[PDB]
Design a protein around this ligand. Sequence first.
Ligand SMILES: Nc1ncnc2c1ncn2[C@@H]1O[C@H](COP(=O)(O)OP(=O)(O)O)[C@@H](O)[C@H]1O
Ligand SMILES: Nc1ncnc2c1ncn2[C@@H]1O[C@H](COP(=O)(O)OP(=O)(O)O)[C@@H](O)[C@H]1O
Ligand SMILES: Nc1ncnc2c1ncn2[C@@H]1O[C@H](COP(=O)(O)OP(=O)(O)O)[C@@H](O)[C@H]1O
Ligand SMILES: [Mg+2]
Ligand SMILES: [Mg+2]
Ligand SMILES: [Mg+2]
Lengths: 372, 372, 372
Amino acid sequence: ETTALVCDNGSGLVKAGFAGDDAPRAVFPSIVGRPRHQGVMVGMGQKDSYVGDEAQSKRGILTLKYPIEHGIITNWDDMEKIWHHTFYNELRVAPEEHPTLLTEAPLNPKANREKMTQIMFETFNVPAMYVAIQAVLSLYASGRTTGIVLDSGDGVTHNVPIYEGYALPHAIMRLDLAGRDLTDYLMKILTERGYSFVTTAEREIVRDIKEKLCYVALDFENEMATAASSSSLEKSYELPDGQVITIGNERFRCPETLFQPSFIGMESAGIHETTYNSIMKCDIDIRKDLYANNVMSGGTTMYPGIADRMQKEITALAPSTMKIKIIAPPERKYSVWIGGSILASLSTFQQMWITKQEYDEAGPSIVHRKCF
Amino acid sequence: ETTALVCDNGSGLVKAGFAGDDAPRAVFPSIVGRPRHQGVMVGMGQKDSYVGDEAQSKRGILTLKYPIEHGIITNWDDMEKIWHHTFYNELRVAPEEHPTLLTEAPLNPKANREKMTQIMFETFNVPAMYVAIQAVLSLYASGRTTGIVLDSGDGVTHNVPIYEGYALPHAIMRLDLAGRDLTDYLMKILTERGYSFVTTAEREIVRDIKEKLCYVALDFENEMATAASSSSLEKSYELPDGQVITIGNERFRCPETLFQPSFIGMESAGIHETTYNSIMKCDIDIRKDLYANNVMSGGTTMYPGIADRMQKEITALAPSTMKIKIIAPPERKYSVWIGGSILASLSTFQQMWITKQEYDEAGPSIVHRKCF
Amino acid sequence: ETTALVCDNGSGLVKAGFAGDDAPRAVFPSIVGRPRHQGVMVGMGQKDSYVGDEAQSKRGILTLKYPIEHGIITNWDDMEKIWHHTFYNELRVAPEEHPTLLTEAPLNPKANREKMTQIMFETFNVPAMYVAIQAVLSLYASGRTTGIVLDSGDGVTHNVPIYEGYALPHAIMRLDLAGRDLTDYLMKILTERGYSFVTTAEREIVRDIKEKLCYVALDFENEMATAASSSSLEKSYELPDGQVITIGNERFRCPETLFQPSFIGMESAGIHETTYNSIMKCDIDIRKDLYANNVMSGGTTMYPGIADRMQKEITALAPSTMKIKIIAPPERKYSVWIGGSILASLSTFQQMWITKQEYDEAGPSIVHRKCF
Ligand SMILES: Nc1ncnc2c1ncn2[C@@H]1O[C@H](COP(=O)(O)OP(=O)(O)O)[C@@H](O)[C@H]1O
Ligand SMILES: Nc1ncnc2c1ncn2[C@@H]1O[C@H](COP(=O)(O)OP(=O)(O)O)[C@@H](O)[C@H]1O
Ligand SMILES: Nc1ncnc2c1ncn2[C@@H]1O[C@H](COP(=O)(O)OP(=O)(O)O)[C@@H](O)[C@H]1O
Ligand SMILES: [Mg+2]
Ligand SMILES: [Mg+2]
Ligand SMILES: [Mg+2]
C-alpha cells in the first residue's frame, strides 16, 4: 500500500497521521463537549456537540467528557465522533481507501479491541486494520529490539519487557495511574493554597498548570524541606480571566504520586518499583540488557527531572555491580505514534493487517488471533 | 480541669458550649452587621457593630455580613468579633482558663486553620486548642466508628467515608453548595411569583421562608406535575409588616438544587451522586458497610423528605443486591457540636490538644501535624 | 506427656491443633495486615497489626502481607506474630508446656529450618519440637507406607516417592507453582473480561472466585471449544459491594496452569509430567506400586476434575500395561495436619523429638541431624 493511517487513539489526547511521516499530522484532545446552558441566539452555528480543539476552544459553555477512561473506551457513541473527526476533519481522508494502524494498552478488556475492530470495518469501512500494543511501538521509535518500556499516558502507566524482539507477557505490568490522576490530584492539593478548580472546564486549566509548572524532585524529603525555607521553588501561573495563582511544593508533590501512589490513596508499587518488579519477573540472563535499555514513553514521562529520578530509583533497587540507563528521548511524547508509523510502513508488516475480506468471514473475534 | 469549650463556628450559624454538655449553650447567626443609615438620636446606646442575635434583631437598619463564605473565613476582623461575642457575651467565660475545640470542613485552605490557631493563642490566649473535621465529629454524636457522613451546613456540603475508625481522604468530597446557595436560589425564584427580596436583611426573611415551608419532593417531575394542577401544595408565609406571600412549586424546587446543582448553573453531581461516588472511591470490602451507615448531618439536611429522597436515589445507583440505610437523627442540626462535645470530653483525647507551650515553639504551622 | 501440638504453618493458610485430634482445632489465613489509611476516631481499639481472621475481616483498610512465600518464611518479625497468634489467641495454650510438631516443604533453604527451630526454643521456650516434610505427613493420613505424594498448597507443589517407608530423595521434585500463582493468574485473566483486581485485599476476593468457581477440564482444547459456543460453562459471583462478575473459560483456564506452567510464563513440566518424572527417577521395581498409589494432598489439589485429569494424564505417560490409581481423600485439604497428628501421637515417635537440652548443647544446627 502507498499510505496507511496510524491512529494512536490515546486517553486524553489523540495522535494521528500517515505511516512513513516522522510526526503526527494531527494531535488534539480526546474530548467530546456538549452545551450546558440555554441557547438564546438564533441565526448561528448552534451545534449539539464539539470534539477535539473545538470543544477546548468553547469550553466555558461546555461539559467536557473523555470517552476513554484508563485506556478503555467507556462511551462508543462519542468515540465514533473522535474517529469521525480524526478522519474527516483534519486528516480529511476517505477511510474506505486507507488501512489503519490502531493502538491499545496491554491487559485491556477483550471487548474493547473487538468493538474497536467492528467499528473500523462496519462504520468506517477501512480496507484493513491492526491493533498494536503501545509499548511495542515505543521500541520501534527508539530503534531497539530489546528494552523495558515504561509508557505513561493520560490513563495508564504500563511496563513491557522485550528481549531480542520477543515480549515476556508474564512480566507485563499495568498501573491505572497516569496524567488524569495527576491532574485530579493537583486539583485536590491546589485547594489547600485556596484555589478551587471544580468543573470539567477547570480540569483543563489544571492540566495546563501541571504541564507548564510541575517537575519530579530528585529527593522528595529534601525538596519538601527546601520549599519550607520558602519562595525559591515557587512559580506563578496566570489563569483565563487574568488572575494569578502562585504554586510551591504542590509543583513537585503532584508528580511524586507516580513514585508514591498512596498520595491518591491507591495501594501499589511506584513506577520505579513497577519497572524493577517487571525486570525481576524476566528470565535472569535478559535482566542486564533490560536495565541498560530502560525506555520511557508518553506524556506523563515529560516532567523535568523524571529520568534522573528514575535512574536514581532503579539504581537503588538493582545490584550495584551493573549499569542502569534511562532512554527518555526528547520526542517521547509521540514515540508510540512514531513507532506505529514505522511498523505500518515496513514491507514485512504488509502481511499482518486484518483485511475486510478476513474480518467478514471471522467476525470481530479475528483481532485476538491476528494481534499481540 | 472540669471543662473544655467546643465551638462549631460554621457558616451562617455558630454553635458554642462546654465539653460534656448535651447540646450547645449558645446558638446564634454567624453574622456581623453595621448601620447603613444616618444616626440622628443623640443620648442613646448608638453602636458601630452588632453581632449574632443583636444583628438579626436590629437588621432593618443594618447591612449584614457573614464573615465565613463556603466554610472559609473571609473577614478576620469580624470573625474576631464573633469569637469575642461567643466567649464573653453568652458563654460568658474567660478563654484564658478553657481549652477550646474548634471545627473545620475538609479540603479547606491551610491558611484558614493557621490564622484561626494564631487568633486562638495570640488574641484569646487559650491554654490549648484543636481543630476537628465537621464530618468526623458527626460520627461521635451518632455513636458509629464506620459510615459515610454527608454533612451539609450553610456554606459547604461534604462527604467523609470512615471505616473501623480510619478515614479514606482520597474518597472525601467537598461541594460548595449548601444552605446559603439554596437561600439565594429561593430569593431568585420568588421573583418569578412577583416578590422582590434583595437586601441582606431580606435574605434572612427568605432564609426563614426556606426553613418554614421548603421540603424535598420524593419524585421531582411528579411533584411538578402535581403542583401544575395547583393549590393543593401551596402554603402562605406572613412577612414582617404583615404582608402574606403564597408559595407553590418553588417550595420543593428550592431543595432540589441539592440533587440538581445545574439549577444554580454549577456543573457538579447532586448530593446523591456525590455520596455514591465517594462510596465507590473507597475500597470494595468497606462499601457494603458504608451504604448501611450513611449518616446525615447539618441544617441543610433538615428538610422534610430528604432522607427518603436520598435513600431512593442511592438505592437506584447502588447494585440492587444490598441494603442502603440512611441515618438522619432528629438532633442532626447539632450533631457536629454534639460530636465535638463527646471528643473534647474523652480521657484518651487529652494528649491531642495543641498546648500554648507547644504552639509558641513551632508557630501556627503546628496545626498541620496535630490535626486531621 | 498428654498432648503435643501440631502446626502446619503453610503458605497463606495455617492449620494448628493437638496430636490425636481428628482435624485442625484452628485454621486461619497465614496473613499479617497493617493499616494503610489514617486513623481519625480517637478513643477506640485502634491497633497496629491484625493477623489471620482479624486481618481477613478488616481487610478493606489494611495492606495484607504473607510472611511465607513459596514455602520460605521471608518475614520473621511477622511469622513470630502468626506463631504467637496460633498459640495464645486460638489454641490458647502455654507454648512452654506442649512439644510442637512443625512442618516444611522438601528442598527448602537450611536457614529456614534453623531459624524456625531457634524461634521455637527461645521465643516460645517449647519443651521439644520436630520439623516433618509435608508429603511424608500426607502418607500417615492415608494409612500407606508406599506411595508418591503430590502435595500442592498455596506456595509450593512437590512430589515425594516413598516405598516400604523409605523415601527416595534423589527423585523428589519441587515446583514453585501452587495456589498463589493460580490466584495471581486469575487476577491477570479476569482483567480481559474487564474486572480489575489489584490491591492485596482484592487478591482475597479473586482467591474466593478461584475456590468457588474454578475447576480442571478433562480435555482443555475441547473445553475451550465448548466455552466458545458460550453461556453453558459461565457462572456468576457476587463481590463485596453487591456487584456481580460473570466468569467463563477463565473458570477452567486458571487451574490448567498446573498442567501448562507456560501460561504464567515459567518453563517447567506440568504436575502430571512432574509426577511421571518423579516415578521414572525411582528404581524400576518400585514403579508398579507408585503408579497404583498416587496421593493428592494440600488445597490446590481440591479443584473438581483434577484427580480425573491427573489419572488421564499419568495414564498417557505411563505404559498401558499397568494400573494408574490416584487416591484423593475428601479431607486432603488437611491430610498434612491429620498425618502430623498421627506422627506426633505414635509411641515410637516420642524419642525422635529435638529436646530443649539437645538444642541448647548443639545450637539450631541440631535440626539437620535429627529431622529429614
Ligand atoms: N510537558 C508535560 N509535562 C507534564 N505532563 C504532560 C506534558 N505534556 C503532556 N503531558 C500529559 O500527558 C498526558 C497524555 O499524554 P499522551 O502521552 O498523549 O497520553 P495518551 O497516549 O493517553 O493520549 C496528558 O494528561 C498531559 O497532561
Ligand atoms: N428546618 C430547616 N429547614 C431547612 N433549612 C434549615 C433548617 N434549619 C436550619 N436550616 C439551614 O441550615 C443552614 C445552616 O445550618 P448549620 O448546620 O448550622 O450550618 P453551619 O454548620 O454552616 O452553620 C442555614 O442556612 C439554615 O437556613
Ligand atoms: N475448593 C478449593 N478449590 C481450589 N482451591 C482451593 C480450595 N480450597 C483451598 N484452595 C486453595 O488452597 C490453597 C492453600 O491450601 P493449603 O493446602 O492449606 O496450602 P498451605 O499448606 O500452603 O496453607 C489456597 O491458595 C486456596 O486458594
Ligand atoms: Mg498513550
Ligand atoms: Mg456545619
Ligand atoms: Mg501445605
